[PDB]
Amino acid sequence: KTLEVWIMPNSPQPAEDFKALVAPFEKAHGVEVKVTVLDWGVAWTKITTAATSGVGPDLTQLGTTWVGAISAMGVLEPVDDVLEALGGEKAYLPAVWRTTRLEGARQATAVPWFSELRAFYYRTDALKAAGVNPAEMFASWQGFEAGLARLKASSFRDPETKAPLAPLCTPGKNSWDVLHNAAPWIWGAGGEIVRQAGGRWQSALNSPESLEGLYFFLSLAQKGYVPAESLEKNTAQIEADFQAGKCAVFASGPWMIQRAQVPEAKGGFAERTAAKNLGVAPYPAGPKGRYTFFGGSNLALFNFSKNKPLAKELLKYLGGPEAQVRYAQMTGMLPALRSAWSDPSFQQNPLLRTFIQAAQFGRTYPSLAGWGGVENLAVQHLGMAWDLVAQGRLTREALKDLMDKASAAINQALR
Amino acid sequence: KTLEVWIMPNSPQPAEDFKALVAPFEKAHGVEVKVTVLDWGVAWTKITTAATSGVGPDLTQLGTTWVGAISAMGVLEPVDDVLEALGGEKAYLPAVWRTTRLEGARQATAVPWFSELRAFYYRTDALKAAGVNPAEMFASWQGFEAGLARLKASSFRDPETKAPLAPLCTPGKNSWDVLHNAAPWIWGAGGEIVRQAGGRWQSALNSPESLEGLYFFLSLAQKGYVPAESLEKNTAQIEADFQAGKCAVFASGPWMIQRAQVPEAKGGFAERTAAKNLGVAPYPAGPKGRYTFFGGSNLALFNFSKNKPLAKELLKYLGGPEAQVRYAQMTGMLPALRSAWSDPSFQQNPLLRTFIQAAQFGRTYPSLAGWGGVENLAVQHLGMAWDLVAQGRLTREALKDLMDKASAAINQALR
Ligand SMILES: OC[C@@H](O)[C@@H](O)CO
Ligand SMILES: OC[C@@H](O)[C@@H](O)CO
Ligand SMILES: [Cl-]
Ligand SMILES: [Cl-]
Ligand SMILES: [Cl-]
Ligand SMILES: [Cl-]
Ligand SMILES: [Cl-]
Ligand SMILES: [Cl-]
Ligand SMILES: [Cl-]
Ligand SMILES: [Cl-]
């Protein structure tokens, strides 16, 4: 008769939106779904209290990077049955399928719900005035840096601010997504954060490939293509700066396309110049590959649930095509289920089509039980590198020393 | 020499504000203080990674309810010496002094930084139009409810919305602060969330007095005083609703006073009717006492720091009068150090003086190592009570059964 589901604040009216999403299921099954919205400030510790105590909801949202840890606690019900009903492994991008279980595991313990991915938004008016061909700028790392250098030299002023635009706005260390902002560059240089090599998971942040990609990215800020002020800010603050006409290029997710249609009094930017001058391109091809950061959230069923068959029906509903389209639109995310990408709500919008192009390059972190420790240690040492950038002190050798320290700490944490 | 400090996003420009705060210390000591801003989305797990790895800053911010858990890990340096230098135990409210150590511990492991406390904001225009005397409304629980009854009956319309105001806005279960919103009512009825007997803490949420206070509070929502919409929302959303003229009364912290002085175009609400009609009163006296929720943040020194003497000088500076006044203003919080309350920046503002009145009633949770699990389990079951409120189905008997379930789970966690 009732299911309890915990979600995070994924949409503008989290509880109301989720209740609208599930109303057809409630009517069809004659059950009530009770949703509780967990601040990302408290979600993780509420979810581990549920895991340790055996007292919790039926379903919980998990960040994709949380799946290995909570799975490793032995508290999640297998959901291979749900995933088979939805079309099995080949219904998902490989990157997304990796997030359905603890890394390496035979059985699924999480159902893909929606995907976060990042692509570059750009000011089409700024690139035109700089003489920057958007295709060349996003076809190679040399192209990207050459585009930022032309944007730096440009006399273009934003029509509202009457000031130059920064070529690239990115956070540095003061954001939740420090590693995610770096990951595409690591990967595109042929690197990785961790590798399963020489008979164990170990850091690869100090590999020559990883170092090349990290140095490429962080050196763009040292060369003057990123404002000093951006390095103090988080991702949300950078979004606001791009809305406000301060930034020619920045990475973000699909939600900005919706925000460009929403009035400022409702937290969008439809009244600003940027809303009418918006382009999107995937991350540029690196020397050793081309990768798009994927994250987002999955759903899991606690093994202590008293309602497992009904909760599995609700996972099949939430994971299936109609609800995938609807909730991706409510959240400004991309559906997890690839069949949902053909919906006209995506295909009729050229900017969302470019996000689907970006999705083809998708890559996630390994689903390690100890992922949060790896990421935390990687980000402490990436922040030390961003501190050198902020002072104009980043060199290849100083970066190598920081990633050797990171690698020692990560490798201890993985033992 | 550099010192490293981790903070959370306490002020509108977190990094730049903190750098401004410490610039005098840096000049005095010829040292650079490097700050990293951690989203409350990730600060806890970053601090436990630091604790387990030895890789971390010199100083970290901690929420007050985090002190027991991090102290129990054995990673914090004793700071009795810093606290004596700031005036010792009697420099602080007793509630704030409780947060300097793990409950029952001999040595202090945290230095009070700033205090979060809640009082009731009210629309002076709405109460006048409803014929409600603010002093009588906030002198007793029966006065409080009588005032809400007059506010429900009132034909007053907000001049901008041209709609009635809700008598009382409060979150229900979809907020980070579910227990904190309930705590003053539990305590004012003579109750508590936990009680020590023997060497054992146990739940007191099913105590007669706790039940009386929780039913009083939750039943105001079942009586029509609180909009259904409020019960879907978090504290920030409710703050926005009060700014937008939807709420006659709501509880929050001192930051709203600054927000009322700031234009909307800069993130405040100075253009709105509520900014021009703002009153503040402490929580009303209960039948068995009068208490104000305190939280906030402290600072701690990791025992693996290689700069403990200099870091303790920085704790003395951040803990001391000039920085206490400056930071409490940046954050919109109350200073932890009582001597700072005499500053003109507080005393020249009648609403901040009312917050200082409210502080005399301050109360905190016990500083238990397992606090987060207690609170998490308590909140799971209070959320089930909020769901009965939303249906008009909360009875004293139903609340008792829910709090007995909460108590069983809590008592298991504390064994
Ligand atoms: O026409 C835009 C289209 O080429 C792609 O973005 C879809 O893949
Ligand atoms: O004038 C207001 C003053 O009474 C107090 O708020 C100080 O305590
Ligand atoms: Cl398995
Ligand atoms: Cl990786
Ligand atoms: Cl992948
Ligand atoms: Cl800094
Ligand atoms: Cl001690
Ligand atoms: Cl208590
Ligand atoms: Cl206390
Ligand atoms: Cl009853």
Side-chain angles (χ1 to χ4, degrees), chain A residues 16 32 34-37 39-41 44-46 49 55-56 173-174 232 237 376-377 379-381 391, chain B residues 6 13 15-16 32 34-37 40-41 44-46 49 53 55-56 173-174 176 232 376 380 391:
Chain A
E16 289 206 331
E32 182 174 337
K34 301 274 203 209
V35 67
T36 307
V37 181
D39 198 301
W40 286 109
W44 172 258
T45 60
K46 288 180 149 163
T49 293
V55 179
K173 66 176 182 173
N174 294 322
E232 295 286 40
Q237 288 175 294
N376 289 345
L377 292 169
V379 163
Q380 295 193 38
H381 290 86
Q391 300 184 309
Chain B
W6 283 1
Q13 295 308 339
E16 281 292 317
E32 182 183 345
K34 297 267 205 225
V35 67
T36 307
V37 183
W40 284 104
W44 171 258
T45 69
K46 285 184 138 146
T49 295
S53 77
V55 180
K173 69 177 180 174
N174 291 327
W176 67 267
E232 297 171 335
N376 290 345
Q380 289 194 27
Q391 297 167 320

Side-chain angles (χ1 to χ4, degrees), chain A residues 79-276:
Chain A
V79 293
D80 298 299
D81 49 1
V82 172
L83 296 176
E84 279 315 306
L86 296 169
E89 177 166 8
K90 309 170 185 174
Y92 299 97
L93 283 165
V96 167
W97 185 252
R98 151 156 248 178
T99 79
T100 63
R101 64 202 63 220
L102 178 57
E103 191 66 22
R106 178 188 76 104
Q107 304 183 278
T109 46
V111 175
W113 198 7
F114 56 84
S115 294
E116 175 173 354
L117 73 170
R118 291 96 170 282
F120 281 103
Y121 286 95
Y122 61 92
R123 281 289 293 274
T124 58
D125 55 341
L127 272 68
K128 186 182 165 55
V132 172
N133 177 263
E136 283 178 345
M137 179 166 177
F138 290 98
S140 69
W141 285 12
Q142 170 292 317
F144 182 76
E145 181 165 0
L148 292 177
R150 294 167 86 201
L151 287 161
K152 188 183 182 50
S154 181
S155 63
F156 185 63
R157 298 176 309 148
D158 180 78
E160 305 187 76
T161 73
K162 302 297 188 183
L165 285 73
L168 174 62
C169 296
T170 179
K173 66 176 182 173
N174 294 322
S175 196
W176 65 270
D177 60 358
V178 173
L179 188 65
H180 317 330
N181 294 336
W185 305 105
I186 296 168
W187 296 323
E192 51 203 333
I193 294 86
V194 291
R195 94 173 102 194
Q196 185 157 45
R200 54 173 174 122
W201 291 93
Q202 51 181 64
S203 178
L205 284 175
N206 59 353
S207 73
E209 287 160 301
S210 294
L211 285 165
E212 174 179 351
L214 282 176
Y215 185 77
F216 176 84
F217 170 45
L218 264 64
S219 79
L220 292 176
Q222 185 160 272
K223 292 166 164 168
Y225 301 137
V226 179
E229 71 164 313
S230 297
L231 304 185
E232 295 286 40
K233 292 176 181 186
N234 64 32
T235 289
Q237 288 175 294
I238 294 303
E239 287 169 3
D241 288 343
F242 178 89
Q243 299 175 190
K246 295 171 69 180
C247 303
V249 176
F250 86 118
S252 185
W255 50 91
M256 296 300 293
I257 291 162
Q258 288 189 39
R259 285 221 214 149
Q261 297 310 123
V262 171
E264 162 180 65
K266 284 167 178 144
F269 67 110
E271 294 95 345
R272 302 277 74 80
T273 302
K276 278 199 159 59

Side-chain angles (χ1 to χ4, degrees), chain B residues 35-374:
Chain B
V35 67
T36 307
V37 183
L38 311 188
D39 192 304
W40 284 104
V42 303
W44 171 258
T45 69
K46 285 184 138 146
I47 292 160
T48 59
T49 295
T52 62
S53 77
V55 180
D58 297 294
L59 304 184
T60 192
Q61 183 178 341
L62 299 176
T64 55
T65 58
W66 298 9
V67 173
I70 306 304
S71 303
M73 297 182 79
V75 298
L76 302 181
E77 185 65 18
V79 290
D80 296 302
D81 53 357
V82 173
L83 299 171
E84 286 310 299
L86 291 169
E89 174 169 4
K90 303 172 192 175
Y92 298 97
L93 284 167
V96 171
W97 187 248
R98 180 173 220 166
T99 76
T100 58
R101 62 201 68 218
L102 171 66
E103 196 89 0
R106 184 175 78 77
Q107 301 177 279
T109 46
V111 177
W113 195 12
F114 55 87
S115 294
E116 178 176 336
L117 73 173
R118 289 97 171 273
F120 279 104
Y121 287 93
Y122 64 92
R123 280 290 294 264
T124 58
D125 59 338
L127 273 68
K128 293 202 184 127
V132 175
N133 181 261
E136 286 177 13
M137 176 160 180
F138 297 97
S140 68
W141 291 7
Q142 310 78 355
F144 186 75
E145 184 164 359
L148 289 176
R150 290 200 67 85
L151 282 162
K152 185 163 65 142
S154 176
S155 62
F156 186 68
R157 299 175 182 271
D158 178 76
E160 302 180 304
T161 71
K162 301 332 280 94
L165 290 74
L168 175 61
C169 299
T170 180
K173 69 177 180 174
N174 291 327
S175 194
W176 67 267
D177 57 4
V178 178
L179 188 63
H180 315 336
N181 296 339
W185 301 106
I186 293 168
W187 295 328
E192 52 200 340
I193 294 140
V194 289
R195 106 156 35 180
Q196 199 177 10
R200 298 317 186 287
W201 289 89
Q202 301 268 272
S203 180
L205 285 169
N206 64 345
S207 73
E209 294 87 356
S210 297
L211 289 170
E212 277 229 62
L214 281 175
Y215 188 75
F216 179 86
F217 174 39
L218 264 64
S219 75
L220 293 175
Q222 182 158 264
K223 293 164 170 168
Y225 301 133
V226 178
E229 137 175 50
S230 299
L231 298 187
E232 297 171 335
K233 291 181 173 173
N234 66 32
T235 295
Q237 290 176 292
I238 299 304
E239 288 170 354
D241 281 349
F242 181 91
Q243 294 177 194
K246 291 173 61 169
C247 303
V249 177
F250 92 112
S252 193
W255 48 87
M256 297 300 292
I257 294 159
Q258 287 183 40
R259 289 180 28 193
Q261 291 160 337
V262 171
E264 248 180 7
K266 282 116 99 149
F269 66 106
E271 296 95 341
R272 299 280 70 77
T273 309
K276 295 81 141 60
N277 293 271
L278 196 59
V280 167
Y283 274 58
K288 286 193 169 175
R290 185 171 189 189
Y291 297 95
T292 297
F293 177 85
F294 268 60
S297 295
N298 298 347
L299 286 157
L301 173 52
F302 280 110
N303 69 12
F304 53 72
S305 176
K306 286 184 186 313
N307 307 293
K308 298 172 173 178
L310 197 51
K312 286 181 171 173
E313 297 302 314
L314 182 54
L315 283 171
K316 292 179 183 172
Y317 176 80
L318 293 170
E322 182 150 37
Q324 279 283 307
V325 168
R326 183 159 35 160
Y327 206 57
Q329 298 298 34
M330 287 169 163
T331 61
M333 291 279 178
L334 186 71
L337 187 73
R338 293 196 288 202
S339 61
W341 298 359
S342 72
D343 192 81
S345 69
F346 297 108
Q347 296 291 332
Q348 282 286 8
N349 187 313
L351 302 177
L352 288 171
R353 293 197 313 269
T354 303
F355 271 98
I356 290 160
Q357 285 181 67
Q360 174 64 3
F361 313 121
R363 183 160 179 180
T364 51
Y365 308 130
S367 288
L368 306 185
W371 183 262
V374 172

